[PDB]
């Protein structure tokens, strides 16, 4: 009923959208992994009379449900998708998207990692993002490579019309008491990567983590703090 939708509020398989700003939504779904249930976020950005999707809904059936929810709530076609790293909460569902007419994109680093891991593989490669601090335009967003953090390939996404910073899994929510799933992380470089984000997007008004509740710029410093303490 208007609050940001939370893990115990979303059955696995269902998707909810949350309006962030004019022409910007997050999508929220839940999935089981190693016997526990987790929420995850993605982004939807209006691109004229089309939509740009950022990240799948973590699984094939969740992603089909995402497309249905978008049709119900927004009613514009998803034409392109970008996955912000190689893990299943970002690319699982790419095959569904690809069969629903959506052109799927990721950096070459993400595509390689996804292939090597046996995850679904976006079709198109996003060049121009291989060095930390690189930025490129993609429809109504800017894609930014901050450096290694949650993963070596993680990208963040900025919506300049709305000053929305979608951190993906490089950014944690304010309630986080740990650094999430760090299997593929670079705990030593992560704070440096976060500092790059802070420097590059000082006017962000909303910051959206890969999992959990949006907030403001404080999510960035909080993330650095939880990662440094996890490393320590
Ligand atoms: C698919 C993905 C994955 C699965 C399950 C949970 C999470 C979590 C996660 C956990 C706790 C919290 N809450 S918190 C900050 O602790 O308070 C959180 F916000 C997120 C994250 C994240 O942190 O982004 N991601 C997850 N995977 C898989 C994976 C490594 N598997 C070995 C093989 N290489 C792939 O690595 C990863 O990320
Ligand atoms: Zn991940
Ligand atoms: Zn994640």
TrEMBL record:
MF terms in GO: beta-lactamase activity; metal ion binding
Question: Which residues participate in Zn(2+) 3 binding?
Answer: 89, 169, 211
Keywords, sorted A to Z: Antibiotic resistance, Hydrolase, Metal-binding, Periplasm, Plasmid, Signal, Zinc
Q: What class of enzyme is it?
A: hydrolase
Q: Name one GO cellular component term.
A: periplasmic space
Required co-factor(s) are: Zn(2+)
Q: How does it assemble?
A: Monomer.
Q: Which family does the similarity line name?
A: Belongs to the metallo-beta-lactamase superfamily. Class-B beta-lactamase family.
Function text: Class B beta-lactamase which confers resistance to the beta-lactam antibiotics, including penicillins, cephalosporins and carbapenems. Acts via hydrolysis of the beta-lactam ring. Has penicillin-, cephalosporin- and carbapenem-hydrolyzing activities.
Q: Which NCBIfam families match?
A: bla_class_B_core, bla_subclass_B1, blaVIM
Q: What is this protein called?
A: beta-lactamase
What is the taxonomic lineage of the source species? Bacteria, Pseudomonadati, Pseudomonadota, Gammaproteobacteria, Pseudomonadales
């Amino acid at each position: 009923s208007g609050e940001y939708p939370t893990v115990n509020e979303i059955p696995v398989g269902e998707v909810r959208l949350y309006q962030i700003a004019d022409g910007v939504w997050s999508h929220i779904a839940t999935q089981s992994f190693d016997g526990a249930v987790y929420p995850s976020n993605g982004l939807i950005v209006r691109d004229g009379d089309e939509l740009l999707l950022i990240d799948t809904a973590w699984g094939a059936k969740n992603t089909a449900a995402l497309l249905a929810e978008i049709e119900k709530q927004i009613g514009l076609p998803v034409t392109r998708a970008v996955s912000t790293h190689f893990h299943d909460d970002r690319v699982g569902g790419v095959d569904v998207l690809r069969a629903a007419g959506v052109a799927t994109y990721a950096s070459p680093s993400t595509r390689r990692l996804a292939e090597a891991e046996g995850n679904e593989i976006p079709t198109h490669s996003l060049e121009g993002l291989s060095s930390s601090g690189d930025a490129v335009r993609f429809g109504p967003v800017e894609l930014f490579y901050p450096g290694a953090a949650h993963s070596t390939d993680n990208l963040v996404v900025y919506v300049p019309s709305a000053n929305v910073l979608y951190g993906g899994c490089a950014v944690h929510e304010l309630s986080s008491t740990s650094a999430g799933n760090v299997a593929d992380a670079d705990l030593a470089e992560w704070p440096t990567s976060v500092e790059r984000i802070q420097k590059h997007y000082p006017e962000a008004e909303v910051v959206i983590p890969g999992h959990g509740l949006p907030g403001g710029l404080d999510l960035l410093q909080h993330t650095a703090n939880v990662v440094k303490a996890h490393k320590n």
